[PDB]
């Protein structure tokens, strides 16, 4: 029963550390995966906007906005692949939020340098890295010695939660068997199937 409990808890722990940036502050743990991905869209919105791009009307190649598009319930959200992560919420990003989602006037006017810094920091500390701690995507060259605490903690506790479910099945099944008295095997002298009618 406790291996049951523990396994379920380990899985929950795994998602806590992966998604939650409140009791696992990104200041201390690095950015979440959603967070880094959102941060990159912000970084390049910022850069291109400084060059003179109108980021609200920039139609990307697909016909969807290059920087901004709508979520399926219509909220203004960052564009590109990060469209999956629009549920992200973090203190560096919420000031640009209006009632309908990201607010283009706040985007045009109100981005402070501390947000450009955090977004750049977080994009370059995305929780991607190799088992031997080369940081980045799998095609990256050696140089950066980094794997996110969030990856370390989520992977370890997935593995641990999984094996503890296996332990649950092992010991629950065995407990049942042992309580009924056939954990050591079948009794040749009273083999239960031999007293059952044939299936056909």
């Amino acid at each position: 029963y406790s291996l049951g409990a523990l396994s379920m808890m380990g899985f929950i722990a795994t998602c806590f550390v992966w998604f939650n940036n409140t009791v696992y502050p990104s200041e201390f743990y690095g950015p979440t995966g959603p967070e880094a991905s959102q941060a990159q869209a912000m970084t390049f919105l910022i850069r291109d906007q400084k060059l003179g791009a109108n980021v609200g009307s920039a139609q990307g190649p697909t016909g969807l906005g290059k920087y901004l598009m709508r979520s399926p319930t219509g909220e203004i959200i960052f564009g590109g692949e990060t469209m999956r992560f629009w549920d992200f919420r973090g203190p560096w990003l919420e000031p640009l939020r209006g009632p309908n989602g990201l607010d283009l006037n706040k985007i045009k006017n109100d981005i402070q340098p501390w947000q450009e810094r955090r977004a750049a920091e977080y994009m370059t500390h995305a929780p991607l890295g190799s088992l031997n701690s080369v940081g980045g995507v799998a095609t990256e060259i050696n140089s950066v010695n980094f794997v996110s605490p969030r990856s370390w903690l989520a992977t370890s506790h997935f593995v641990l939660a999984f094996f503890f479910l296996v332990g649950h099945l092992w010991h629950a099944g065995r407990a049942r068997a042992a309580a009924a008295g056939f954990e050591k095997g079948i009794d040749r002298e009273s083999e239960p199937v031999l007293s059952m009618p044939s299936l056909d």
Binding site: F44, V137, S151, E183
Partner: protein
């Protein structure tokens, strides 16, 4: 007795041709729904905008696929991890466009298969068997959870779960190597040892038991008729198979306890596939394969390439082409 007891007794009857059981009560409806939807979608479903960019992929036979290219396509990236039941769509037409059948199939299937495992425990209890077959099955089940649930969770979208198709499976494997260098991950190398070794030990055990069948038939009938179902005795000479195999290698590299030998056959593939399921599950959180890119350099500092650098050039070819219209910014962070 009373009605609920007649029912309980039927559900758990060891006399039904197929055991139902309490796990069966959930398994049957969920697998039926998953199977009917999958068969209909595979044949008839229209194209699905998998990556959320209004670039629909045709997966079904009626829209120009064959058995090898067809698939039920994962749900839209625009959806990410949102729950997308039929009733959340404004119309079946919208649900088909955004890949809803995929969510329906895999949720009902993970449920159904999780209960299939419980059913294996359940019947072994009603039969007075030992209980751990279901443990063996946890290895394949764990693997399905990884490609259909865990990997989408880490990456934030069901659009990156495994497609339900022959070629779609290949797509998923190539993108995976590009993004996680899975070949260079020890858990995947443990998976390959698992299945290679399982195939090996499978051929070995079969070859070795077949090699030592007791002459109980003539040359004109199948050897198999020398075994009668339920016979008290054994139909091969395990001592002779040890005598052969012990000499093939050496006497103690060979098993002479039938129970130790069969436990080994169970444990080798199960453990290895546990590891490779955990490999997908941890690469889901971007703890990737070993990275040895430009690891050897010479006295001046020139990069001296290894085979790891040659792999990396293939990976890069996968990286820059996959989902060719889907990235606007230079890093592909999930």
């Amino acid at each position: 007795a009373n009605l609920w007891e007649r029912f309980c007794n039927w559900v758990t009857s060891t006399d039904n041709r197929l055991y139902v059981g309490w796990f069966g009560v959930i398994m049957i409806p969920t697998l039926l729904a998953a199977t009917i939807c999958f068969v209909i979608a595979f044949i008839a479903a229209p194209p699905v905008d998998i990556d959320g960019i209004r670039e629909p992929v045709s997966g079904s036979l009626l829209y120009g696929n064959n058995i090898i290219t067809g698939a039920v396509v994962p749900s839209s990236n625009a959806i990410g991890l949102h729950f997308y039941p039929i009733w959340e769509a404004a119309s079946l037409d919208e649900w088909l466009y955004n890949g809803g059948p995929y969510q329906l199939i895999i949720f009902h299937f993970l449920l159904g298969a999780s209960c299939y495992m419980g059913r294996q425990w359940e019947l072994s209890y009603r039969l007075g068997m030992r209980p751990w077959i279901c443990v063996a099955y946890s290895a394949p089940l764990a693997s399905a959870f990884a490609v259909f649930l865990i990997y989408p969770i880490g990456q934030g979208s069901f659009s990156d779960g495994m497609p339900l198709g022959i070629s779609g499976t290949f797509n998923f494997m190539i993108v995976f190597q590009a993004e996680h260098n899975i070949l260079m991950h020890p858990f995947h190398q443990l998976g390959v040892a698992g299945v290679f070794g399982g195939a090996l030990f499978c051929a070995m055990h079969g070859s070795l038991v077949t090699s030592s069948l007791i002459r109980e038939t003539t040359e004109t009938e199948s050897a198999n008729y020398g075994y009668k179902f339920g016979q008290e005795e054994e139909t091969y000479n395990i001592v002779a198979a040890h005598g052969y195999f012990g000499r093939l290698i050496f006497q103690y590299a060979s098993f002479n306890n039938s129970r130790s030998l069969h436990f080994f056959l169970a444990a080798w593939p199960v453990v290895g596939v546990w590891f490779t399921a955990l490999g997908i599950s941890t690469m889901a959180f971007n703890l990737n394969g070993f990275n040895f890119n430009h690891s050897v350099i010479d006295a001046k500092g020139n990069v001296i390439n290894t085979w790891a650098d040659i792999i990396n050039r293939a990976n890069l070819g996968m990286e820059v082409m996959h989902e060719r219209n889907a990235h606007n910014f230079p890093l592909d962070l999930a």
